[PDB]
PDB file of all heavy atoms in Angstrom:
ATOM      1  N   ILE A   1      40.281 178.791 144.677  1.00  0.00           N
ATOM      2  CA  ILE A   1      39.045 178.619 145.607  1.00  0.00           C
ATOM      3  C   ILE A   1      38.002 179.200 144.846  1.00  0.00           C
ATOM      4  O   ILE A   1      37.888 180.362 144.475  1.00  0.00           O
ATOM      5  CB  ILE A   1      39.294 179.276 147.004  1.00  0.00           C
ATOM      6  CG1 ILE A   1      40.699 178.892 147.550  1.00  0.00           C
ATOM      7  CG2 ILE A   1      38.189 178.913 147.923  1.00  0.00           C
ATOM      8  CD1 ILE A   1      40.912 179.473 148.893  1.00  0.00           C
ATOM      9  N   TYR A   2      36.984 178.397 144.642  1.00  0.00           N
ATOM     10  CA  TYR A   2      35.596 179.056 144.085  1.00  0.00           C
ATOM     11  C   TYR A   2      34.502 178.388 144.821  1.00  0.00           C
ATOM     12  O   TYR A   2      34.333 177.221 144.876  1.00  0.00           O
ATOM     13  CB  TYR A   2      35.502 178.739 142.565  1.00  0.00           C
ATOM     14  CG  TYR A   2      34.233 179.216 141.889  1.00  0.00           C
ATOM     15  CD1 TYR A   2      34.235 180.409 141.377  1.00  0.00           C
ATOM     16  CD2 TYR A   2      33.014 178.389 141.905  1.00  0.00           C
ATOM     17  CE1 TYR A   2      32.959 181.059 140.817  1.00  0.00           C
ATOM     18  CE2 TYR A   2      31.845 178.944 141.419  1.00  0.00           C
ATOM     19  CZ  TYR A   2      31.814 180.161 140.879  1.00  0.00           C
ATOM     20  OH  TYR A   2      30.579 180.651 140.314  1.00  0.00           O
ATOM     21  N   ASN A   3      33.569 179.221 145.406  1.00  0.00           N
ATOM     22  CA  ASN A   3      32.528 178.822 146.279  1.00  0.00           C
ATOM     23  C   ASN A   3      32.906 177.837 147.279  1.00  0.00           C
ATOM     24  O   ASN A   3      32.212 176.832 147.596  1.00  0.00           O
ATOM     25  CB  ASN A   3      31.444 178.055 145.312  1.00  0.00           C
ATOM     26  CG  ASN A   3      30.023 178.585 145.489  1.00  0.00           C
ATOM     27  OD1 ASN A   3      29.562 179.034 144.409  1.00  0.00           O
ATOM     28  ND2 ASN A   3      29.572 178.417 146.769  1.00  0.00           N
ATOM     29  N   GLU A   4      34.127 178.083 147.892  1.00  0.00           N
ATOM     30  CA  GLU A   4      34.626 177.262 148.990  1.00  0.00           C
ATOM     31  C   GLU A   4      35.074 175.778 148.638  1.00  0.00           C
ATOM     32  O   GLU A   4      35.129 174.887 149.505  1.00  0.00           O
ATOM     33  CB  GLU A   4      33.636 177.188 150.241  1.00  0.00           C
ATOM     34  CG  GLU A   4      33.583 178.492 151.081  1.00  0.00           C
ATOM     35  CD  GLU A   4      35.017 178.953 151.502  1.00  0.00           C
ATOM     36  OE1 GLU A   4      35.527 178.557 152.682  1.00  0.00           O
ATOM     37  OE2 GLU A   4      35.587 179.784 150.862  1.00  0.00           O
ATOM     38  N   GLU A   5      35.225 175.618 147.390  1.00  0.00           N
ATOM     39  CA  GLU A   5      35.764 174.403 146.871  1.00  0.00           C
ATOM     40  C   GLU A   5      37.146 174.637 146.310  1.00  0.00           C
ATOM     41  O   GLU A   5      37.441 175.857 145.799  1.00  0.00           O
ATOM     42  CB  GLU A   5      34.917 173.866 145.714  1.00  0.00           C
ATOM     43  CG  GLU A   5      33.647 173.452 146.118  1.00  0.00           C
ATOM     44  CD  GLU A   5      32.746 172.730 145.125  1.00  0.00           C
ATOM     45  OE1 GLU A   5      33.118 172.640 143.850  1.00  0.00           O
ATOM     46  OE2 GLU A   5      31.675 172.130 145.449  1.00  0.00           O
ATOM     47  N   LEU A   6      38.045 173.672 146.185  1.00  0.00           N
ATOM     48  CA  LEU A   6      39.377 173.739 145.851  1.00  0.00           C
ATOM     49  C   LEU A   6      39.705 173.145 144.667  1.00  0.00           C
ATOM     50  O   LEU A   6      39.279 171.999 144.319  1.00  0.00           O
ATOM     51  CB  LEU A   6      40.310 173.203 147.024  1.00  0.00           C
ATOM     52  CG  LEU A   6      40.209 173.691 148.357  1.00  0.00           C
ATOM     53  CD1 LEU A   6      41.274 172.978 149.322  1.00  0.00           C
ATOM     54  CD2 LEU A   6      40.368 175.276 148.562  1.00  0.00           C
ATOM     55  N   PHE A   7      40.481 173.851 143.733  1.00  0.00           N
ATOM     56  CA  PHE A   7      40.903 173.380 142.449  1.00  0.00           C
ATOM     57  C   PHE A   7      42.284 173.499 142.194  1.00  0.00           C
ATOM     58  O   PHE A   7      42.969 174.487 142.681  1.00  0.00           O
ATOM     59  CB  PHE A   7      40.107 174.156 141.334  1.00  0.00           C
ATOM     60  CG  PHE A   7      38.644 174.095 141.600  1.00  0.00           C
ATOM     61  CD1 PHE A   7      37.920 175.080 142.365  1.00  0.00           C
ATOM     62  CD2 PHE A   7      37.861 172.984 141.018  1.00  0.00           C
ATOM     63  CE1 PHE A   7      36.702 174.951 142.634  1.00  0.00           C
ATOM     64  CE2 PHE A   7      36.521 172.862 141.248  1.00  0.00           C
ATOM     65  CZ  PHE A   7      35.834 173.881 142.028  1.00  0.00           C
ATOM     66  N   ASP A   8      42.890 172.612 141.411  1.00  0.00           N
ATOM     67  CA  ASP A   8      44.243 172.581 141.001  1.00  0.00           C
ATOM     68  C   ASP A   8      44.339 173.098 139.557  1.00  0.00           C
ATOM     69  O   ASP A   8      43.949 172.314 138.639  1.00  0.00           O
ATOM     70  CB  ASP A   8      44.848 171.272 141.232  1.00  0.00           C
ATOM     71  CG  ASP A   8      46.362 171.196 140.789  1.00  0.00           C
ATOM     72  OD1 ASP A   8      46.856 172.004 140.062  1.00  0.00           O
ATOM     73  OD2 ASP A   8      47.018 170.088 141.051  1.00  0.00           O
ATOM     74  N   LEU A   9      44.789 174.217 139.221  1.00  0.00           N
ATOM     75  CA  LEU A   9      44.866 174.835 137.967  1.00  0.00           C
ATOM     76  C   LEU A   9      46.182 174.569 137.226  1.00  0.00           C
ATOM     77  O   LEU A   9      46.295 175.059 136.072  1.00  0.00           O
ATOM     78  CB  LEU A   9      44.512 176.317 138.022  1.00  0.00           C
ATOM     79  CG  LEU A   9      43.098 176.787 138.008  1.00  0.00           C
ATOM     80  CD1 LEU A   9      42.308 176.661 136.694  1.00  0.00           C
ATOM     81  CD2 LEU A   9      42.279 176.077 139.039  1.00  0.00           C
ATOM     82  N   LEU A  10      47.182 173.914 137.707  1.00  0.00           N
ATOM     83  CA  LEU A  10      48.366 173.506 136.888  1.00  0.00           C
ATOM     84  C   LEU A  10      48.456 172.100 136.631  1.00  0.00           C
ATOM     85  O   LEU A  10      49.098 171.733 135.500  1.00  0.00           O
ATOM     86  CB  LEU A  10      49.609 173.891 137.721  1.00  0.00           C
ATOM     87  CG  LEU A  10      49.981 175.399 137.765  1.00  0.00           C
ATOM     88  CD1 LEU A  10      51.197 175.612 138.562  1.00  0.00           C
ATOM     89  CD2 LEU A  10      49.798 176.069 136.389  1.00  0.00           C
ATOM     90  N   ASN A  11      47.947 171.035 137.215  1.00  0.00           N
ATOM     91  CA  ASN A  11      47.892 169.713 136.985  1.00  0.00           C
ATOM     92  C   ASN A  11      47.590 169.278 135.518  1.00  0.00           C
ATOM     93  O   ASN A  11      46.423 169.510 135.185  1.00  0.00           O
ATOM     94  CB  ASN A  11      47.090 168.877 137.957  1.00  0.00           C
ATOM     95  CG  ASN A  11      47.104 167.367 137.873  1.00  0.00           C
ATOM     96  OD1 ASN A  11      46.544 166.602 138.632  1.00  0.00           O
ATOM     97  ND2 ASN A  11      47.878 166.917 136.798  1.00  0.00           N
ATOM     98  N   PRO A  12      48.649 169.000 134.732  1.00  0.00           N
ATOM     99  CA  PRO A  12      48.396 168.675 133.313  1.00  0.00           C
ATOM    100  C   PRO A  12      47.549 167.445 132.912  1.00  0.00           C
ATOM    101  O   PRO A  12      47.204 167.305 131.785  1.00  0.00           O
ATOM    102  CB  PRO A  12      49.833 168.612 132.683  1.00  0.00           C
ATOM    103  CG  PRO A  12      50.644 168.231 133.869  1.00  0.00           C
ATOM    104  CD  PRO A  12      50.025 168.856 135.147  1.00  0.00           C
ATOM    105  N   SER A  13      47.298 166.679 133.948  1.00  0.00           N
ATOM    106  CA  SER A  13      46.624 165.341 133.694  1.00  0.00           C
ATOM    107  C   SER A  13      45.361 165.054 134.450  1.00  0.00           C
ATOM    108  O   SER A  13      44.848 164.051 134.649  1.00  0.00           O
ATOM    109  CB  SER A  13      47.638 164.215 133.795  1.00  0.00           C
ATOM    110  OG  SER A  13      48.525 164.441 134.889  1.00  0.00           O
ATOM    111  N   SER A  14      44.758 166.186 135.042  1.00  0.00           N
ATOM    112  CA  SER A  14      43.494 166.038 135.722  1.00  0.00           C
ATOM    113  C   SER A  14      42.682 167.321 135.101  1.00  0.00           C
ATOM    114  O   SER A  14      43.188 168.281 134.848  1.00  0.00           O
ATOM    115  CB  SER A  14      43.543 166.111 137.262  1.00  0.00           C
ATOM    116  OG  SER A  14      43.501 167.412 137.766  1.00  0.00           O
ATOM    117  N   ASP A  15      41.224 167.011 135.100  1.00  0.00           N
ATOM    118  CA  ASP A  15      40.457 168.179 134.746  1.00  0.00           C
ATOM    119  C   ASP A  15      40.159 169.071 135.860  1.00  0.00           C
ATOM    120  O   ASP A  15      40.082 168.690 137.000  1.00  0.00           O
ATOM    121  CB  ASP A  15      39.226 167.842 133.953  1.00  0.00           C
ATOM    122  CG  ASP A  15      38.543 166.466 134.509  1.00  0.00           C
ATOM    123  OD1 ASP A  15      38.897 166.150 135.693  1.00  0.00           O
ATOM    124  OD2 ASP A  15      37.882 165.813 133.903  1.00  0.00           O
ATOM    125  N   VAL A  16      40.104 170.411 135.649  1.00  0.00           N
ATOM    126  CA  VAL A  16      39.856 171.418 136.627  1.00  0.00           C
ATOM    127  C   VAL A  16      38.869 170.997 137.617  1.00  0.00           C
ATOM    128  O   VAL A  16      38.801 171.379 138.798  1.00  0.00           O
ATOM    129  CB  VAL A  16      39.740 172.799 136.172  1.00  0.00           C
ATOM    130  CG1 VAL A  16      41.033 173.361 135.761  1.00  0.00           C
ATOM    131  CG2 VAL A  16      38.615 173.145 135.118  1.00  0.00           C
ATOM    132  N   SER A  17      37.683 170.517 137.079  1.00  0.00           N
ATOM    133  CA  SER A  17      36.536 170.110 137.797  1.00  0.00           C
ATOM    134  C   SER A  17      36.548 169.319 139.147  1.00  0.00           C
ATOM    135  O   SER A  17      35.698 169.476 140.059  1.00  0.00           O
ATOM    136  CB  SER A  17      35.412 169.515 136.766  1.00  0.00           C
ATOM    137  OG  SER A  17      35.868 168.326 136.223  1.00  0.00           O
ATOM    138  N   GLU A  18      37.623 168.509 139.075  1.00  0.00           N
ATOM    139  CA  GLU A  18      37.964 167.618 140.284  1.00  0.00           C
ATOM    140  C   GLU A  18      38.305 168.556 141.506  1.00  0.00           C
ATOM    141  O   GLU A  18      39.415 169.192 141.472  1.00  0.00           O
ATOM    142  CB  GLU A  18      39.105 166.788 139.987  1.00  0.00           C
ATOM    143  CG  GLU A  18      38.945 165.600 138.924  1.00  0.00           C
ATOM    144  CD  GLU A  18      40.234 164.751 138.685  1.00  0.00           C
ATOM    145  OE1 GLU A  18      40.730 164.298 139.816  1.00  0.00           O
ATOM    146  OE2 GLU A  18      40.668 164.462 137.532  1.00  0.00           O
ATOM    147  N   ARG A  19      37.468 168.554 142.398  1.00  0.00           N
ATOM    148  CA  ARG A  19      37.759 169.349 143.693  1.00  0.00           C
ATOM    149  C   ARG A  19      38.804 168.625 144.606  1.00  0.00           C
ATOM    150  O   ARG A  19      39.006 167.472 144.558  1.00  0.00           O
ATOM    151  CB  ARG A  19      36.587 169.643 144.471  1.00  0.00           C
ATOM    152  CG  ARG A  19      35.402 170.187 143.886  1.00  0.00           C
ATOM    153  CD  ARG A  19      34.169 169.751 144.531  1.00  0.00           C
ATOM    154  NE  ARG A  19      34.263 169.728 146.073  1.00  0.00           N
ATOM    155  CZ  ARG A  19      34.340 168.554 146.809  1.00  0.00           C
ATOM    156  NH1 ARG A  19      34.200 167.333 146.230  1.00  0.00           N
ATOM    157  NH2 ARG A  19      34.452 168.647 148.065  1.00  0.00           N
ATOM    158  N   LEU A  20      39.518 169.319 145.384  1.00  0.00           N
ATOM    159  CA  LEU A  20      40.608 168.754 146.262  1.00  0.00           C
ATOM    160  C   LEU A  20      40.020 168.756 147.647  1.00  0.00           C
ATOM    161  O   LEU A  20      39.232 169.640 147.963  1.00  0.00           O
ATOM    162  CB  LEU A  20      41.892 169.551 146.154  1.00  0.00           C
ATOM    163  CG  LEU A  20      42.500 169.943 144.730  1.00  0.00           C
ATOM    164  CD1 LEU A  20      43.618 170.893 145.014  1.00  0.00           C
ATOM    165  CD2 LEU A  20      42.950 168.649 143.986  1.00  0.00           C
ATOM    166  N   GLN A  21      40.634 167.941 148.563  1.00  0.00           N
ATOM    167  CA  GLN A  21      40.219 167.970 149.954  1.00  0.00           C
ATOM    168  C   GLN A  21      41.281 168.543 150.774  1.00  0.00           C
ATOM    169  O   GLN A  21      42.437 168.287 150.474  1.00  0.00           O
ATOM    170  CB  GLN A  21      39.962 166.646 150.571  1.00  0.00           C
ATOM    171  CG  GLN A  21      38.844 165.750 149.824  1.00  0.00           C
ATOM    172  CD  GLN A  21      38.905 164.366 150.626  1.00  0.00           C
ATOM    173  OE1 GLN A  21      38.432 164.280 151.618  1.00  0.00           O
ATOM    174  NE2 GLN A  21      39.411 163.344 149.919  1.00  0.00           N
ATOM    175  N   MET A  22      41.020 169.290 151.890  1.00  0.00           N
ATOM    176  CA  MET A  22      41.966 169.787 152.752  1.00  0.00           C
ATOM    177  C   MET A  22      41.749 169.341 154.272  1.00  0.00           C
ATOM    178  O   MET A  22      40.649 169.013 154.747  1.00  0.00           O
ATOM    179  CB  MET A  22      42.065 171.343 152.669  1.00  0.00           C
ATOM    180  CG  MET A  22      40.976 172.212 153.407  1.00  0.00           C
ATOM    181  SD  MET A  22      41.396 173.957 153.177  1.00  0.00           S
ATOM    182  CE  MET A  22      42.055 174.351 154.847  1.00  0.00           C
ATOM    183  N   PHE A  23      42.882 169.373 154.965  1.00  0.00           N
ATOM    184  CA  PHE A  23      42.893 168.731 156.410  1.00  0.00           C
ATOM    185  C   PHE A  23      43.955 169.442 157.040  1.00  0.00           C
ATOM    186  O   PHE A  23      44.949 170.092 156.499  1.00  0.00           O
ATOM    187  CB  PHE A  23      43.469 167.284 156.152  1.00  0.00           C
ATOM    188  CG  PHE A  23      42.709 166.404 155.259  1.00  0.00           C
ATOM    189  CD1 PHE A  23      43.033 166.164 153.975  1.00  0.00           C
ATOM    190  CD2 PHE A  23      41.540 165.692 155.665  1.00  0.00           C
ATOM    191  CE1 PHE A  23      42.348 165.260 153.077  1.00  0.00           C
ATOM    192  CE2 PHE A  23      40.844 164.722 154.861  1.00  0.00           C
ATOM    193  CZ  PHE A  23      41.305 164.688 153.584  1.00  0.00           C
ATOM    194  N   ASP A  24      43.933 169.587 158.366  1.00  0.00           N
ATOM    195  CA  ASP A  24      44.984 170.054 159.180  1.00  0.00           C
ATOM    196  C   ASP A  24      46.293 169.146 159.234  1.00  0.00           C
ATOM    197  O   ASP A  24      46.132 167.872 159.003  1.00  0.00           O
ATOM    198  CB  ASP A  24      44.535 170.159 160.714  1.00  0.00           C
ATOM    199  CG  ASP A  24      43.345 171.070 160.828  1.00  0.00           C
ATOM    200  OD1 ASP A  24      43.465 172.239 160.221  1.00  0.00           O
ATOM    201  OD2 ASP A  24      42.420 170.715 161.427  1.00  0.00           O
ATOM    202  N   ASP A  25      47.457 169.838 159.217  1.00  0.00           N
ATOM    203  CA  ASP A  25      48.692 169.245 159.180  1.00  0.00           C
ATOM    204  C   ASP A  25      49.160 168.920 160.508  1.00  0.00           C
ATOM    205  O   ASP A  25      49.469 169.895 161.311  1.00  0.00           O
ATOM    206  CB  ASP A  25      49.681 169.979 158.487  1.00  0.00           C
ATOM    207  CG  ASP A  25      51.118 169.313 158.320  1.00  0.00           C
ATOM    208  OD1 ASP A  25      51.296 168.374 159.003  1.00  0.00           O
ATOM    209  OD2 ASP A  25      51.868 169.907 157.494  1.00  0.00           O
ATOM    210  N   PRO A  26      49.052 167.672 161.037  1.00  0.00           N
ATOM    211  CA  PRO A  26      49.531 167.345 162.389  1.00  0.00           C
ATOM    212  C   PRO A  26      50.836 167.814 162.962  1.00  0.00           C
ATOM    213  O   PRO A  26      51.048 168.129 164.138  1.00  0.00           O
ATOM    214  CB  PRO A  26      49.623 165.721 162.327  1.00  0.00           C
ATOM    215  CG  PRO A  26      48.652 165.417 161.307  1.00  0.00           C
ATOM    216  CD  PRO A  26      48.844 166.478 160.235  1.00  0.00           C
ATOM    217  N   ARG A  27      51.837 168.114 161.987  1.00  0.00           N
ATOM    218  CA  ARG A  27      53.213 168.653 162.330  1.00  0.00           C
ATOM    219  C   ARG A  27      53.157 170.248 162.485  1.00  0.00           C
ATOM    220  O   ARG A  27      53.693 170.808 163.409  1.00  0.00           O
ATOM    221  CB  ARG A  27      54.267 168.069 161.558  1.00  0.00           C
ATOM    222  CG  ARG A  27      54.142 166.618 161.255  1.00  0.00           C
ATOM    223  CD  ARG A  27      53.812 166.390 159.704  1.00  0.00           C
ATOM    224  NE  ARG A  27      54.842 166.838 158.861  1.00  0.00           N
ATOM    225  CZ  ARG A  27      54.745 166.803 157.511  1.00  0.00           C
ATOM    226  NH1 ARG A  27      53.532 166.533 156.959  1.00  0.00           N
ATOM    227  NH2 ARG A  27      55.739 167.148 156.719  1.00  0.00           N
ATOM    228  N   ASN A  28      52.719 170.831 161.497  1.00  0.00           N
ATOM    229  CA  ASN A  28      52.769 172.363 161.292  1.00  0.00           C
ATOM    230  C   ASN A  28      51.453 172.970 161.769  1.00  0.00           C
ATOM    231  O   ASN A  28      50.358 172.734 161.372  1.00  0.00           O
ATOM    232  CB  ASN A  28      52.974 172.732 159.819  1.00  0.00           C
ATOM    233  CG  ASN A  28      54.262 172.184 159.220  1.00  0.00           C
ATOM    234  OD1 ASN A  28      54.481 170.980 158.989  1.00  0.00           O
ATOM    235  ND2 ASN A  28      55.193 173.081 158.794  1.00  0.00           N
ATOM    236  N   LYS A  29      51.578 173.658 162.865  1.00  0.00           N
ATOM    237  CA  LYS A  29      50.450 174.285 163.679  1.00  0.00           C
ATOM    238  C   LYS A  29      49.499 175.335 162.932  1.00  0.00           C
ATOM    239  O   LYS A  29      48.272 175.078 163.089  1.00  0.00           O
ATOM    240  CB  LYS A  29      50.978 175.010 164.974  1.00  0.00           C
ATOM    241  CG  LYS A  29      50.747 174.113 166.285  1.00  0.00           C
ATOM    242  CD  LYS A  29      51.094 172.520 166.058  1.00  0.00           C
ATOM    243  CE  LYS A  29      51.183 171.800 167.316  1.00  0.00           C
ATOM    244  NZ  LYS A  29      52.540 171.942 168.035  1.00  0.00           N
ATOM    245  N   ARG A  30      50.031 176.175 162.290  1.00  0.00           N
ATOM    246  CA  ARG A  30      49.069 177.002 161.540  1.00  0.00           C
ATOM    247  C   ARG A  30      49.116 176.612 159.972  1.00  0.00           C
ATOM    248  O   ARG A  30      49.019 177.375 159.159  1.00  0.00           O
ATOM    249  CB  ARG A  30      49.316 178.659 161.630  1.00  0.00           C
ATOM    250  CG  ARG A  30      50.765 179.116 161.973  1.00  0.00           C
ATOM    251  CD  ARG A  30      50.736 180.756 162.125  1.00  0.00           C
ATOM    252  NE  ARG A  30      49.679 181.043 163.121  1.00  0.00           N
ATOM    253  CZ  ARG A  30      48.820 182.090 163.008  1.00  0.00           C
ATOM    254  NH1 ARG A  30      48.965 182.936 162.042  1.00  0.00           N
ATOM    255  NH2 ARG A  30      47.949 182.157 164.107  1.00  0.00           N
ATOM    256  N   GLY A  31      49.255 175.231 159.845  1.00  0.00           N
ATOM    257  CA  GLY A  31      49.425 174.627 158.559  1.00  0.00           C
ATOM    258  C   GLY A  31      48.362 173.652 158.137  1.00  0.00           C
ATOM    259  O   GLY A  31      47.588 173.186 159.026  1.00  0.00           O
ATOM    260  N   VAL A  32      48.278 173.388 156.827  1.00  0.00           N
ATOM    261  CA  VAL A  32      47.219 172.508 156.256  1.00  0.00           C
ATOM    262  C   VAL A  32      47.809 171.596 155.258  1.00  0.00           C
ATOM    263  O   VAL A  32      48.954 171.920 154.628  1.00  0.00           O
ATOM    264  CB  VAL A  32      46.062 173.326 155.638  1.00  0.00           C
ATOM    265  CG1 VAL A  32      45.302 174.115 156.653  1.00  0.00           C
ATOM    266  CG2 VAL A  32      46.546 174.228 154.347  1.00  0.00           C
ATOM    267  N   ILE A  33      47.215 170.475 155.012  1.00  0.00           N
ATOM    268  CA  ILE A  33      47.423 169.598 153.977  1.00  0.00           C
ATOM    269  C   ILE A  33      46.474 169.582 152.782  1.00  0.00           C
ATOM    270  O   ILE A  33      45.250 169.270 153.101  1.00  0.00           O
ATOM    271  CB  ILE A  33      47.706 168.064 154.337  1.00  0.00           C
ATOM    272  CG1 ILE A  33      49.085 167.952 155.042  1.00  0.00           C
ATOM    273  CG2 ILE A  33      47.490 167.060 153.377  1.00  0.00           C
ATOM    274  CD1 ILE A  33      50.322 168.114 154.059  1.00  0.00           C
TER     275      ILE A  33
END
């Protein structure tokens, strides 16, 4: 997490610059997707 944006630092085939989106997980209550 940097400046409230999300990054995947392991993905071998995407550049770090691509931010990810998050959402609530309809099944898991204190959970996210």
Side-chain angles (χ1 to χ4, degrees):
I1 310 179
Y2 179 91
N3 230 122
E4 292 302 274
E5 296 187 348
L6 300 186
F7 304 93
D8 175 348
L9 276 283
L10 290 181
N11 188 170
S13 38
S14 91
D15 39 21
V16 287
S17 60
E18 291 186 48
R19 307 151 40 251
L20 309 169
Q21 302 177 73
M22 77 180 258
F23 308 93
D24 301 311
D25 185 344
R27 318 109 72 189
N28 299 68
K29 255 46 167 273
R30 28 184 55 220
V32 294
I33 281 298

